[model samples]
Target: ADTKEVLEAREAYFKSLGGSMKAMTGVAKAFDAEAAKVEAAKLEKILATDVAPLFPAGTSSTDLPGQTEAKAAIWANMDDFGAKGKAMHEAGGAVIAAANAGDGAAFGAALQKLGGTCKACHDDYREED
Candidate 1:
C-alpha cells in the first residue's frame, strides 16, 4: 500500500519543512530587523505543523531514496531518533512561545537549542550531501 505518490508526498512535505527551517535561520540573522518577534513567531508555527508530522509513528526513513541523506541509523536507533525529533519540536515550541511573549533573547536561545537538536539528528541519521 505504500504507493510512490505517498512516498513522494511525504518527501515533499519534509522538504517544505526544511525550507521553512532554512528561512527561520535567515530570520534569526535579521533579529535586529524590525518586528523580528513577529517573523520568528510565524516560523515557530511552521515548525510545529510542518516539521513535526514528517516523523509520524511507523514512518520509516527508508522510504526515501537517492542517497536519501537519511541513514540506516534512523531505523537502527529508532527510539532515539523519535526522541530527538520530539525534543526538536519541543524546543521549537519554546521558541514560538518566547517569540510570542516578545522575549527576543529567550527566542534566540531557544532557536539555538532547536538547531542543535536538528544537527544532532542529522549528524547521526543523515548521509553526506
Candidate 2:
C-alpha cells in the first residue's frame, strides 16, 4: 500500500479503537454490563488484526513530517512494536473476557491493563499531535 493510504488506514483503526475504549469506560457500570461487553468485543475485533503491516518502513513522522504521528523508531524497532501490538491485543482479550463474565473488579483490572498498553505504545511510538 501507498504511504498515505497506509497512514490513513492506521489512523482510522486507532481512532475506532479509541472510540470503543471510550464507550467501554462509559458503560462499565453493572447496569450496562452488556454494553460494556459489546464495546470490549468491538475493541478485541479491531485489535485482532496485525496492524504492524500498516506502519511500513517509510510512513513515520521522520519520513512524512506533519502527515503522521508515528515515530521513526517504529520502523527501526519493528519487532518491539509488534510485541507491543500483541500485548494490546492480549489486553483486549482480557477486557472482553472480564466483561463477558460480568465481573466488575476483573473488568476494571483488565481495563487498566488495556489502558497501560495503549499508553505505553503511544509514548514510545507516537509523536505528540
The residue-by-residue lDDT of candidate 2 on 25-62, one tens digit each, is 66654435677777777777766766666666455576
Q: How many clashes (backbone atoms < 3 Å, residues ≥3 apart in a chain or on different chains) does model 1 have?
A: 0
Q: Candidate 2 — what's its lDDT? A: 0.67
Taking the tens digit of each residue's C-alpha lDDT, what string does model 1 give over 1-129? 544454466576555445435545666677763444654655565466644444553334466554444534454355676677667777667877767776767667776677676667666665545
RMSD of each candidate relative to the true structure: 4.2, 3.1
Off by over 4 Å in 2: 1-3, 29-31, 63-67, 73-76, 126-129
Error of 1 at 65 (Å): 9.7
Angstrom error at residue 86, model 2:
0.5
